[PDB]
Every structure is written in structure tokens, then in C-alpha cells.
Design a protein around this ligand. Structure first.
Ligand code: FQ8
Ligand code: FQ8
Ligand code: FQ8
Ligand code: CL
Ligand code: CL
Ligand code: CL
Ligand code: CL
Ligand code: CL
Ligand code: CL
Ligand code: MG
Lengths: 318, 317, 312
């Protein structure tokens, strides 16, 4: 009666490309009655092209049309979560492909290892969006560790999540920012679960490529640090410092506008951006700083001091 | 009306002046089509300089200033008042003109309706450097300040159309001992459109032989004022681009560019940086994106008036 | 009156002390011309150290402090009060004298009317000054030309009259740099310094509030010197000391270290307060590679010190 997996896919003005994606979900080795594809269209306005593609699969998919374009994937994904009563959910971007053995292999690995989270190796088609690599370099891992398995470098929601963890902890995608909302979701999930699995037999998920003040972005980063320091799984304060320090390293290596200081950004926007970054990082205990990779020691201290010249210099030395 | 007035200030040049005066009198241009105006800034070398000039009585126009002005500005202004020619050419007392300089530059200017003609510079000896990049594309009939590196050749050792100087009342200032020639060329560039570059010969040979910044930065301030008030370059974004290019030139070749890590007394470094900071902070930040990016930190350090940051910026350059 | 008093503080040295005491008793100098004064800083090693010293009863002068002072200053001051010799020589409890150390240094000092004689240092195990000894013997040395600010240990022969007349005592402000302060006070109150390099005469055997209070006293000693009265000469000496402090000072690389942020700020604050009492006229005598680091410390700017260290 209860499905193994709910695949949740937001759509917006995808057009004829959506065929390839929907086909990748319908052609799974997993029994077709054991899973569902939930499509949530974020009020496509492409002269019905996207709706016409979805109408060809009526009765093979669950479908909901939002009355207004929300602007990001958070509202559609939350709609999908409310609609799913499956054991696991898997979030899929509308332009991406699943390997034919993705749902079966990931579910089976998860069930065998009582996993709250299963991460399948990502492949990529074309230049653009990059995919994590370090997380998959140790082959299959049944009981993975956030730090040892580089999970803070793979925080997309393009993964298999146990629904009971999402329901019990009332984990929803937040809508206060256009960026990093998927990171916050995965962090909230990681901080409320213990069992993480990594499957690398195939490229199970293929990513297909074809002036912010920072008030909203750093509000999201603030929530990530809050999630770590309030974790009911990682309760030891020193363990929280280590996790926070590892996130700080990831943020300085891969964060939005990481090289803003020496950029062509207007001075007043640099000041506002650094002010938000500084305010957010200064709510993070300095005890975390010793867990940050040492090359970033000056840059991190420059941000804490809210000193644009020092950040500019730090970046020139990196 | 003469084609060209060559204007040459003198001061205690002595016997070396023969070579220079001879280079002007030996031109391919018809000798009745141009004049050499010599303005002596009250030489006091026991009449040696005056004795050299007296050998060309009747062949040059000459004026003796009653007192040494201290810089070339007053003599050059005197020369401008004395000239009624179509073009003026400023010559330094120790330098040489190629025999085809006046004819080739004038002809190129007349053919291209040029307000400004720049002849390729040669140099003899170490000391004063000369621009090179401006001459690397050969002859250019309608040059562009940015594309032809004109902000890297701001000497007045050029042929200027007199009507532009007269209509816009362009005079050399006496605010400072340095960069007054730059200000003059900038004022001229911002009030004219047609610039020509001639590279067939080394037309002008520079010959080498041998403090608080209040006055210098007052002159730099006037250069930025000239750019942002230009009746030729009226588009505000074009002004930002020009101002950014000047900022780059100032950081690459300005007076005391490496003051921060120098043996200058701390208190003098602070006063110098304070004048630099005050001047640059009157320039819109919109210009900063047009500055060559290696200087991004040094420029921001100067805007913040932060000596430590300028010292660090210089160590990283 | 003895030629030399060797002053040796002890604390929990144990059986190793035999080798040191033997090196002092086996000198080419007539044994009646010198004395070894041992001041134990209340050793608590089950009497092991006292048992070693008791084997030389009648061959050494000995005093036991009632309480461990924590630093060599109190024991060395006790030794100074006990000595009536022409010269004193301070010896660390684990170190060795060459057999010709007292004789050769004393003779060189007497022949050159030296207030201070410095014998070449050797080392056993995993440092000692080198530049001071690179010109061979120097009868009338110069602080700057002979790199004396790079050899400020008290492991030297000092004329006692200079110590007595100027009331020079080891201070107890800090556990560190008290020997430097003593040698600086001595140098600033004397003229005749000698360097002897014939042998390795001496073998070394292997809070910032308090430390910078001591560094402050070193600068005070230079700027109050009755020997070096010329203000420009004081600036040169102060600048040379600043160079030595940046090259060899305690926690020289604190800024990029694993020190807690709040301790870095307190340390730099003390360093800044101390250096800002030193005239900026001295800065031009500091080796130019340190120009940014020195200015960073004067500005009390942790980020700039961190950057300065990354560029050094
Ligand atoms: O020894 P440390 O910790 O200093 O160094 C870490 C390792 O050297 C690590 O292996 C490297 O960082 C290289 O990692 P990688 O090659 O395995 O991963 C590359 C990036 O993590 C990845 O391309 C991006 O960061 C994408 O990040 P995601 O966590 O997958 O999702 C974030 C993204 O969806 C979005 O929320 C944000 O990009 C919006 O700002
Ligand atoms: O602009 P960017 O950042 O993309 O790159 C610049 C290029 O690398 C370019 O090729 C060069 O910088 C251009 O320099 P150059 O090789 O043509 O040499 C020209 C120099 O600017 C020249 O040596 C002098 O620095 C410029 O002196 P003047 O323009 O003749 O100034 C008049 C001078 O007598 C006087 O105003 C100053 O002595 C008063 O300080
Ligand atoms: O930059 P300049 O031109 O002025 O010269 C730098 C040259 O490189 C110079 O020749 C060297 O610094 C000379 O050094 P060195 O090779 O003769 O000796 C190295 C150090 O001086 C030496 O390792 C220690 O600094 C010795 O310190 P002490 O003067 O014996 O201090 C006493 C010490 O027990 C104590 O006070 C310290 O532990 C204080 O924390
Ligand atoms: Cl972990
Ligand atoms: Cl934002
Ligand atoms: Cl908060
Ligand atoms: Cl824990
Ligand atoms: Cl991010
Ligand atoms: Cl000038
Ligand atoms: Mg700074």
C-alpha cells in the first residue's frame, strides 16, 4: 500500500526536454507500483508547452499545478513532500536524468543499512553546474561520516531521504532566500539523522547543463550554523565546533561570491555584503576556527573583523 | 600667419643650446612658414646662455623674463601670448628635432584636421623615459585616448592647434613644479577630438644629461576636474573610463609611487597619503572598475587613507 | 680578594650536576684565585641534587633558599651579595666550562681593562650566538659592529665593581629575558668589552604583561645610558634591539599561531604599548624587511601583523 520511493520534480517552462527526464524516471528496474513521480509545475507560462509534455503521462504520474510562480524550487518541493506518504523521497531537477537502476540500487542499499540518507554518484553532461567528486572516491560506504566522506561538499537534495525523519522533525524547504535553501534542507536532515550511505556502482544521477546585498543568503547561512549547534544527534559542543569549522571551510572554498572583495562590485555593495557575512560568522563560536583549514586563517579573521582591505589582501595571498 | 611656432624656455643651458637651436633652424619646412620663440627664465650663468642666443639674433624671436619663475609654465605662457601661428610645438632646451619634424607633423595634422599631432620620441642616455606603446600601431590619423595609450604620453612635446588653446583659454598653471605639462595636455585633450600619431621617424629626441604633496595633488585634482567637465567627452560613463585610465597611469608612473615602503619619515608618509586620499576621494568610485585590476587593493588602500594597507599593496605588486 | 666568583643556581639537577661542578673545579686557574658559589633554589627531588652538592663540601660555597623563587634571578642576586671577587661568571647548572675558561678570560680582561669578557660558546644537542665570534679575538668590541645585542646571556665574565657601583640586580618582573635586561644594564653602564674565541670556553648542554615590562626596561636602560649619551646613538642601539626582538623574541610568530584570539590581542596590546614608548627615530635603524611588521605592531593591528608574517 505504502510506496518505497516518491520522486519529487518541480517544473517551470522546461518544454520538450522534460520528455527525456520523465522517461528516465518511468524506465526504472524498480517495480513501477513500488514508486511514484510527483510533478509540481510552478505555473509554467510557455504557451502550454510544458503542460502538454506532462499531459502525455497523465495516469503514470501524480501532478499538481501551483496558481502562481513561487520563483524557487522550495514551494514546489514542499508541495511534493505533503503529497508523498512513501518510505523515501528523491528530489529530481526537471532537466536531469536518473540511471535505470537508481531507485532500486539506492533503496536496496538504504534498506540493507537502515540508512536515513543514500547518496548516488553524480555524472554530468556539458559545462556549467559542477558535481561533487571527493564523496565518491572511497567507493561504497554503508555508514558514512560527514567530515571523513566530504558530505559538506555534496549538500544538494538530489539524494534519497527517509520520509519519517522529514515528518518527525517537520523539515521543510525555507523561502527567505533564492540560493542555498537545498544546503539548509540537507544540513537540517544530516543534523537530525545518523545513518548515511554512499553508492558509487553507477552514475545514478546525471546533472544535464544546457546585485544581491546578501541579507537573504547570509540569513540561510545563519540557519545552517543554527542547525549544527542545535543538533540532537551531534550534542557534544566540541563536535559542533568541528562541524561548524568544516562548513566554514566549504563556505570559503565554494560560497556565493567567494571573491567579492577584489571584484568589480560597487564599494557600497561590498560593505553591505561583508557586513552580513561578518554579522553571521560572529554568531559562530571562535572555538570552531581551529577546525577551519589553516590557509583560510587570515581570510576568516578578516571577515570576523569586518575589514574589507584585509579580505582583499587575504584573497591576493590565497 | 605662420604654420608653426616652436616655443623653447631656457635657463642656464650654456653651449649645449647650439645643438637644440640648430635642430629647429635645420627643418625641411620652408623657413618662412615657422618661427622659434626663445623665452629665457632669467639665466644667471655669467651670460653664457644669453651669449649662445645672441648668435641667432634676427633668426629667432627672443624674450628675457625679469625674474626666474622656477618652472617652465611662465616661459611657455609667454611663448603662447607671442605666437599667432596655426600650431605651436613646445621644445625643451636640451632636446633635438628631426629635420622632417615640423613638415611631416604639420602636413599629417592639416590632412587629418588634427587638433594634436604626436611624433615618435627617441631618447639619448638614461634618465627621463619616453612613451613606446602609443607608437606601436604605426601612423594613426584619428587616435583614441584609451586604445592608443595617450594618457601614457602627456608631455607637451607635441604639435597643438593654437585655436583650441585660445578659444578655451588653456594656460600652464603654477600650482606645482611637477605635472603642470600633464594638466595642460589633459585640458587640451578634453577640449578637442582629432588626435594624430606619426611614427615614420624619431621626430623628437629627449636628451638626458646631469614634498608634502599639497601642490602636486592640487594639480592631480585639476586633471580629474578637466575629465569630468569635458565638453567633448560628455557621457558620464566615458568620463569614468577616462578617469580610471588616468588613475592607472598615476599608480604606474606618479611622483613617489613607492612612498609607503620608502625611507620617508612616518609623519611625511601620513601627510602625503592624506593629500592623495583627499584627492582620490573626490573621484567617483564608478571609475574604479576601469582601473587595471592589479591596482585594485592599492587604490582602495589610498581611498581608505590606510598606510599599512598601501605598504602591503606595494609588497604584493 | 678572589679573581673570579662563579655563580651557579641549581634546581632538581640531580646526578648531571657532577659534570658541571667538575668542569669548574678542573680549571688551569690557581684553585685559590677563584670560588664556585652554588645557590640551590629549594630543590625538592628527594635530596638527589643536595646529595651531589654535599660531595664537594669544603671545595664550594653553598646557600639553600628557603622557597623556590621560580626563576634564576633570586639565586643569582644571592650569589652577587656573597661574592667579593674582581669578576663574576654566571654558569647554568647543566653547562660545562673549558679547563682554560677562567684563566684565559680573566687574563684577557685584565690585559684590556675589560668590564665584560665574552668567551666563544659551544653547544651539545638540539642554539648559541655565532656572529659575535666571527672576527676572532676583539680587545675593545662595539655593541653594533660585534653583534653583542645577539649575545645577551649572562654566561660571561662581568667586572663586579660596575655591578656594585650601579647597583645592577636581576629583576623578577618575568620568568624570561631577565638575563638580557641585566647584560643590557651592564653594557649601558660600561665601555670596555672583550671577545675571546681561542676555544669553546662555555658549552651549553641541551604572561606578556610581565615579558613586555622587561622589554620596556631594556629600552629605558638604553635611553638613560650615561655611557651612550648621544640621542642619535640611543636611537641606533634601540633600533638594533628592535631588530633582535623581531628576529629572536619570545612568541615572534604569535599572530598566525594556534594561540586563542583573545590572548593574541592581549599579547599584541602589550607589545604595541611597549614599542610606542620607543621613539620612531629608532625605526630607521631597524632592518628594512621588518618595516611592515614593526609598523603593524605600532598600529596595534593583529591582521597587519598576520599579513606581515605571511610576507616574511
Ligand atoms: O581538506 P579541505 O576540507 O580544506 O578541502 C576539501 C577537499 O579538498 C574537497 O575534496 C574539495 O573541496 C573538492 O570537493 P569536490 O570536488 O568533491 O566538490 C565540489 C563542490 O563541493 C561542488 O561542486 C559545489 O560546492 C556544489 O555544492 P553542493 O554541496 O553539491 O550544493 C550546493 C548548491 O546546490 C547550491 O546550494 C549552492 O551552490 C548555492 O550557492
Ligand atoms: O594601462 P594598462 O594597465 O592596460 O597597461 C599599460 C601598458 O603596460 C603600457 O604599454 C605601458 O604602461 C605604457 O607605458 P610606455 O611603455 O608607453 O611608456 C610611457 C610612460 O608613461 C613614460 O615612460 C612616462 O611614465 C610618461 O611620461 P610623460 O607622459 O611623458 O609625462 C610628462 C612628464 O614629463 C611629466 O608630466 C612628469 O615627469 C611629471 O611627473
Ligand atoms: O638584521 P641584522 O643585520 O641586525 O643581523 C641579523 C643577522 O642574522 C645576525 O648575524 C644574526 O641574527 C646573529 O644571530 P646568531 O647566529 O649570532 O645567534 C642567534 C641568536 O642570537 C641566538 O639563537 C639567541 O637569540 C641567543 O639569545 P641570547 O642573546 O643568548 O638571550 C638569552 C636567552 O637565554 C634568553 O634571554 C631568551 O630565551 C629570551 O627569550
Ligand atoms: Cl563527522
Ligand atoms: Cl542575498
Ligand atoms: Cl540569529
Ligand atoms: Cl556528538
Ligand atoms: Cl553557497
Ligand atoms: Cl610641470
Ligand atoms: Mg588592515
Amino acid at each position: 500500500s505504502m510506496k518505497k520511493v516518491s520522486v519529487i520534480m518541480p517544473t517551470f517552462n522546461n518544454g520538450e526536454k522534460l520528455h527525456r527526464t520523465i522517461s528516465s524516471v518511468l524506465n526504472q528496474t524498480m517495480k513501477s507500483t513500488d514508486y511514484e513521480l510527483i510533478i509540481i509545475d510552478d505555473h509554467s507560462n510557455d504557451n502550454g508547452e510544458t503542460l502538454n509534455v506532462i499531459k502525455k503521462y497523465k495516469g503514470l504520474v501524480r501532478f499538481k499545478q501551483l496558481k502562481k510562480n513561487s520563483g524557487n524550487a522550495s514551494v514546489p518541493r514542499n508541495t511534493g513532500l505533503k503529497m508523498s506518504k512513501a518510505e523515501y523521497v528523491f528530489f529530481l531537477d526537471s532537466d536531469d536524468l536518473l540511471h535505470e537502476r537508481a531507485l532500486e540500487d539506492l533503496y536496496n542499499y538504504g534498506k540493507e543499512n537502515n540508512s536515513d540518507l543514500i547518496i548516488g554518484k553524480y555524472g554530468v553532461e556539458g559545462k556549467g553546474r559542477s558535481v561533487p567528486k571527493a564523496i565518491f572516491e572511497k567507493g561504497n560506504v554503508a555508514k558514512a561520516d560527514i567530515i571523513d566522506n566530504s558530505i559538506f561538499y555534496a549538500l544538494s537534495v538530489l539524494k534519497m531521504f527517509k520520509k519519517s525523519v522529514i515528518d518527525k522533525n517537520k523539515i521543510k524547504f525555507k523561502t527567505f532566500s533564492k540560493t542555498a535553501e537545498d544546503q539548509l534542507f540537507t544540513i537540517e536532515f544530516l543534523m537530525n539523522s545518523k545513518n548515511y550511505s554512499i553508492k558509487t556502482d553507477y552514475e545514478y544521477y546525471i546533472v544535464v547543463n544546457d546585485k544581491s546585498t546578501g541579507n537573504q543568503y547570509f540569513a540561510t547561512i545563519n540557519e545552517i550554523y543554527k542547525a549544527i549547534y542545535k543538533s540532537p544527534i551531534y550534542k557534544n559542543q566540541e563536535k559542533r565546533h568541528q562541524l561548524a569549522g568544516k562548513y566554514t571551510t566549504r563556505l570559503l572554498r565554494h560560497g556565493q561570491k567567494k571573491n567579492f572583495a577584489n571584484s568589480k562590485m560597487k564599494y557600497e555593495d561590498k560593505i553591505e555584503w561583508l557586513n552580513n557575512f561578518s554579522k553571521t560568522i560572529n554568531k559562530v563560536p571562535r572555538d570552531s576556527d581551529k577546525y577551519v583549514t589553516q590557509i583560510f586563517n587570515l581570510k576568516l579573521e578578516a571577515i570576523r573583523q569586518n575589514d574589507l582591505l584585509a579580505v582583499m589582501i587575504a584573497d591576493k595571498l590565497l
